[PDB]
């Protein structure tokens, strides 16, 4: 009944580490005392329900706050000038000066200027009044209420799902593909065609009249006759103004491509057609697997048969079905890797192809969103690899994977790790050397000696996609090619203009700075992969510790014997690779932010000139753009960016405090706590007040965790401020 009820070992633990480790292993349900697989799965299911309810509550809170305290209605009239308000500020610590400064956005109270793009998203989606946002918040609140009740219900005795149902892979994948992806995307396309395109074209479609108003003048007669080109006929004109009927068409499903000229975002007809088609594909693919009707596929059979001839990949994929369906960590790793790749994809695609009206001219929101999603992508990738390592050290069965495609990975892990080391070494050596060459050459007053490699291959991709300033004249750039001619009446007439228009972030012009920074990004990705892959492959054992699987995933060490065994557990591989995830995402975000600040400000010949050397990054990006942030508050007064300056210094302080736990280790602090225990016990008066848990220094893995925590939170706070405040102060 003591705090770690799930772990009787921590229950008998008498020191203060009991509380730390109980909180830390609260959610490590697999290793809890007296745990069975069925109970584990049911608990995971209920926790998923609660988590979904949290997500929808967060969404409803954002919606309600913008409805109640935000200037959504005023912003709708003038999207490009009025600054969106996130929520009102309630702070008794604010002075009169801060009150006047934070009173902004055309309201009489202090407020926070939204940098999440929710205003643009909802305006594009079809929200026009605070009432719609409030009703959305109410409905999401009801949804979360139902999800919480469902989570409670699915732990009851008569309503507790079984392990066979949990492990029913075919039905789950069929339903997720067909309905969760497919029918939900179909629902979104229907929403667009019924509510968003009419609202963009100046029609108020809501629940009271969406049943009466026809999305298309012809109705479903074209859909049933098969003359679906009537839904593309009469597209929106280039003189269309978003939210008004002037210049508005009647088409509901088009493939115009490019961007809407006024809003510089893709056409809602194009997006509706996208979601409709993509759903067709997914609803088809959700009929792949066999579920209670004979017709379909058997995933175990597929994996078993996929073994190439003559044992090229050993025994092929035999046993992989069993390992994946038995081990939740492998499923978690696959999910995290896929979702991290998808997060990187959305980060790369939203800025290049904006979808929300007037987002492109909102420079702060774009940078905030890109940085946000790139960081989360990095975290998801690190988690995918960490859970792969946990699977290897906890759930991997060599008897099942005898001569398997997965076992051969462990078989030639030495080759894999050595070659990842080679490529990381080459990339870092050469990228750093070229950067230093450029640094010294510009330093010595002779920039002509800079070694500047043109990214010819990326430029060739841009030319093949439609760029023409490079003059390569290949594929779509060459109007005559089969690629350019076959698609010349669907999307190219708009895409060509969009890509060759220099006012867009679609396929930005690139140069030697882009070459060098891309090779740096390659170095970051390769080294992070090296650390993570090595951790995963050596989690089971090593020449320095062949029996590591007995110790498990996260243990402090093996002692000073055999030369020392620091950070050998393959959890410390994750903890090391987290630094590199932060490093490479920071490089990515610095590249994005500087190139986009230059492009938005209209001087791309600052990035093209200065980015070739590192002092250009240190001066024309960091030092130059740090002035509006650090000048948030000074001796003469304060501005509305004082919060960003304070949070900038805050992230610096946390990043610095992490170095304490990372550098100084447990013995010093343990002995110091012995001294403090002596003092407290020996002083009078205070010694009547006595602890219950014996105070001890933080454990080794605990302190590694705390130091990495302080590092990461620090990273994100510092760049968030610098990316949100410098953009605001420069535009």
């Amino acid at each position: 009944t003591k705090f770690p009820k799930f772990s009787q070992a921590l229950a008998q633990d008498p020191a203060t580490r009991r509380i730390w480790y109980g909180i830390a292993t609260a959610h490590d349900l697999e290793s809890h005392d007296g745990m069975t697989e069925e109970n584990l799965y049911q608990k995971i299911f209920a926790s998923h329900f609660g988590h979904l309810a949290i997500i929808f509550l967060w969404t409803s809170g954002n919606l309600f706050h913008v409805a109640w305290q935000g200037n959504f209605q005023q912003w709708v009239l003038n999207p490009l000038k009025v600054k969106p308000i996130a929520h009102a500020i309630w702070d008794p610590h604010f002075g009169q000066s801060a009150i006047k400064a934070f009173t902004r956005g055309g309201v009489s109270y202090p407020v926070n200027i939204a940098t999440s793009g929710v205003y643009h998203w909802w305006y594009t989606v079809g929200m026009r009044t605070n009432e719609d946002l409030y009703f959305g918040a109410l409905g999401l609140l009801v949804l979360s209420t139902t999800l919480l009740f469902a989570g409670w219900l699915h732990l009851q005795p008569k309503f507790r799902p079984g392990i066979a149902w949990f492990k029913n892979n075919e039905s789950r994948l069929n339903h997720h593909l067909s309905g969760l992806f497919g029918v939900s995307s179909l629902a979104w396309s229907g929403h667009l065609i019924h509510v968003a395109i009419p609202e963009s074209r100046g029609q108020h479609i809501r629940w009271n009249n969406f049943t009466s108003t026809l999305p298309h003048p012809e109705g479903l007669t074209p859909f049933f006759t098969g003359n679906w080109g009537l839904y593309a006929e009469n597209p929106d004109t280039a003189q269309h103004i978003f939210g008004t009927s002037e210049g508005a068409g009647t088409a509901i499903l088009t493939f115009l491509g490019g961007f809407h000229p006024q809003t510089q975002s893709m056409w809602l007809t194009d997006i509706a057609h996208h979601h409709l088609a993509i759903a067709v594909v997914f609803i088809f693919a959700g009929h792949m697997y066999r579920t209670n009707w004979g017709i379909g596929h058997s995933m175990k059979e597929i994996l078993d048969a996929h073994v190439p001839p003559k044992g090229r990949l050993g025994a092929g994929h035999r046993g992989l079905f069993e390992t994946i369906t038995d081990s939740l960590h492998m499923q978690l790793g696959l999910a995290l890797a896929s979702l991290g790749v998808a997060t990187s994809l959305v980060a790369q695609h939203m800025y290049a192809l904006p979808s929300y009206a007037f987002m492109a001219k909102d420079y702060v929101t774009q940078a905030a969103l890109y940085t946000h999603h790139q960081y989360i992508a990095g975290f998801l990738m690190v988690g995918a690899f960490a859970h792969g390592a946990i699977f290897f050290v906890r759930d991997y069965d060599p008897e099942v994977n005898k001569d398997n495609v997965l076992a051969r990975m462990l078989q030639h892990k030495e080759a894999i790790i050595s070659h990842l080391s080679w490529v990381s070494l080459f990339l870092g050596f050469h990228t750093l050397g070229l950067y230093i060459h450029n640094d010294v050459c510009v330093a010595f007053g002779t920039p002509e000696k800079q070694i500047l490699f043109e990214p010819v291959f990326a430029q060739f991709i841009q030319a093949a996609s439609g760029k023409a300033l490079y003059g390569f004249d290949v594929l779509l750039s060459s109007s005559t090619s089969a690629a350019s001619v076959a698609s010349s009446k669907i999307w190219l007439p708009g895409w060509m203009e969009a890509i060759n228009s220099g006012k867009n972030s679609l396929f930005l012009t690139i140069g030697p700075g882009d070459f060098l920074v891309h090779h740096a990004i390659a170095l970051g990705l390769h080294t992070t992969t090296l650390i993570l892959v090595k951790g995963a492959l050596d989690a089971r054992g090593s020449k320095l510790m062949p029996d590591k699987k007995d110790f498990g995933y996260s243990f402090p060490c093996d002692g000073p014997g055999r030369g020392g065994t620091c950070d050998i557990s393959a959890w410390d591989a994750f903890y090391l690779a987290m630094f590199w995830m932060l490093n490479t995402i920071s490089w990515v975000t610095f590249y994005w932010h500087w190139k986009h600040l230059t492009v938005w400000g209209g001087n791309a010949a600052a990035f093209n000139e200065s980015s070739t050397y590192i002092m250009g990054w240190l001066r024309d990006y960091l030092w130059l753009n740090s002035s509006p942030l650090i000048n948030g508050y000074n001796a003469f007064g304060m501005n509305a960016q004082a919060v960003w300056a304070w949070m900038f210094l805050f992230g610096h302080l946390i990043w610095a405090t992490g170095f304490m736990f990372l550098i100084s280790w447990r013995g010093y602090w343990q002995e110091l706590i012995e001294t403090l225990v002596w003092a407290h016990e020996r002083t009078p008066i205070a010694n009547l007040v006595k602890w219950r848990d014996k105070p001890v220094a933080l454990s080794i893995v605990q302190a590694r965790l705390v130091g990495l925590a302080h590092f990461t939170v620090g990273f994100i706070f510092t760049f968030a401020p610098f990316v949100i405040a410098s953009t605001t102060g420069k535009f």
Partner: peptide
Amino acid sequence: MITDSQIFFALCIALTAAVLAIGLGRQLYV
């Protein structure tokens, strides 16, 4: 303009959700 009654109704639904959250936390704790 969101009204006082609207805010109070949303707050009531939020309180119902809170009660359900305590219940779900209990049932996950057992």
